[PDB]
Amino acid sequence: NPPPPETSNPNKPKRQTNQLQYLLRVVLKTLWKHQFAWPFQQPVDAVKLNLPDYYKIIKTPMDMGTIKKRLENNYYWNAQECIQDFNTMFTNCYIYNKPGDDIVLMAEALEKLFLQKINELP
Ligand SMILES: Cc1ccc(-n2nc(C(=O)N3CCN(C)CC3)nc2-c2ccc3c(c2)N(C2CCCC2)[C@H](C)C(=O)N3C)c(C)c1
């Protein structure tokens, strides 16, 4: 398993905006409780899953556990940067798997809810 993405970085400039607080308070925390959220709450554990292929395919891994910690640590400059991590998470899933796979269906459901919630930001 590779090291998970960084959640703090003393040399990177940080910011806290209304949009970012909303991404944590509303967008992430509602997505988290969704019945299909559990696969995406931590990095893919390829060792546990016996998927030595996953990290051969996915070069920029991302997950909501990481995003959560990054929001909690004020790691982001703006909302858009955080939104890019959500979209990287979803697109990783669609790259690695095939349409109709159970995990893809799960990601699809979360992505629509995600898009619905970010449609209007503070
Ligand atoms: C349908 C399904 C949903 C989730 C999971 N599990 N289970 C754990 C686990 O070992 N966990 C998670 C929950 N926790 C409580 C115990 C540890 N991890 C995942 C998991 C997380 C993320 C992904 C995948 C699996 N798959 C795919 C791998 C083949 C099938 C789909 C690929 C990597 C995909 O791209 N991503 C995003 C499984 C076995 C089947």
UniProtKB/Swiss-Prot annotation:
* Modification note: Phosphorylation by CK2 disrupt the intramolecular binding between the bromo domain 2 and the NPS region and promotes binding between the NPS and the BID regions, leading to activate the protein and promote binding to acetylated histones. In absence of phosphorylation, BRD4 does not localize to p53/TP53 target gene promoters, phosphorylation promoting recruitment to p53/TP53 target promoters.
The record's comment on protein family reads: Belongs to the BET family.
Q: Where in the cell is it found?
A: Nucleus; Chromosome
Protein known as: Bromodomain-containing protein 4
- Tissue-wise expression: Ubiquitously expressed.
The superkingdom listed in its UniProt entry is Eukaryota
| Quaternary context | Interacts with p53/TP53; the interaction is direct. Interacts (via CTD region) with CDK9 and CCNT1, acting as an associated component of P-TEFb complex. Interacts with RELA (when acetylated at 'Lys-310'). Interacts (via NET domain) with NSD3, CHD4, BICRA and ATAD5. The interaction with BICRA bridges BRD4 to the GBAF complex. Interacts (via NET domain) with JMJD6 (via JmjC and N-terminal domains); the interaction is stronger in presence of ssRNA and recruits JMJD6 on distal enhancers. Interacts with NSD3. Interacts with NIPBL.
Function of the protein: Chromatin reader protein that recognizes and binds acetylated histones and plays a key role in transmission of epigenetic memory across cell divisions and transcription regulation. Remains associated with acetylated chromatin throughout the entire cell cycle and provides epigenetic memory for postmitotic G1 gene transcription by preserving acetylated chromatin status and maintaining high-order chromatin structure. During interphase, plays a key role in regulating the transcription of signal-inducible genes by associating with the P-TEFb complex and recruiting it to promoters.
Q: What is known of its domains?
A: The NET domain mediates interaction with a number of chromatin proteins involved in transcription regulation (NSD3, JMJD6, CHD4, GLTSCR1 and ATAD5). The C-terminal (CTD) region mediates interaction and recruitment of CDK9 and CCNT1 subunits of the P-TEFb complex. It is also required for maintenance of higher-order chromatin structure.
Task: Please state which portion of the whole protein this structure contains, as first and last residue out of the total length.
Answer: 44 to 165 of 1362
Outcome following mutation: residue 97 to A: Abolishes binding to acetylated histones
Q: Where is this site: Acetylated histone binding?
A: 97
Entry coiled-coil feature ranges: none
- Disease tied to this protein: Cornelia de Lange syndrome 6: A form of Cornelia de Lange syndrome, a clinically heterogeneous developmental disorder associated with malformations affecting multiple systems. It is characterized by facial dysmorphisms, abnormal hands and feet, growth delay, cognitive retardation, hirsutism, gastroesophageal dysfunction and cardiac, ophthalmologic and genitourinary anomalies. CDLS6 inheritance is autosomal dominant.
Q: Where is this cross-link: Glycyl lysine isopeptide (Lys-Gly) (interchain with G-Cter in SUMO2)?
A: 56
At the highest ranks, the source species' classification is: Eukaryota, Metazoa, Chordata, Craniata, Vertebrata
Misc = JQ1, a thieno-triazolo-1,4-diazepine derivative, and I-BET, a benzodiazepine derivative, have been tested on tumors with success. Treatment with GSK1210151A (I-BET151, a I-BET derivative) has strong effets on mixed lineage leukemia and promotes myeloid differentiation and leukemia stem-cell depletion.
Q: Which gene encodes it?
A: BRD4
Q: Which residues form the Bromo domain?
A: 15-121
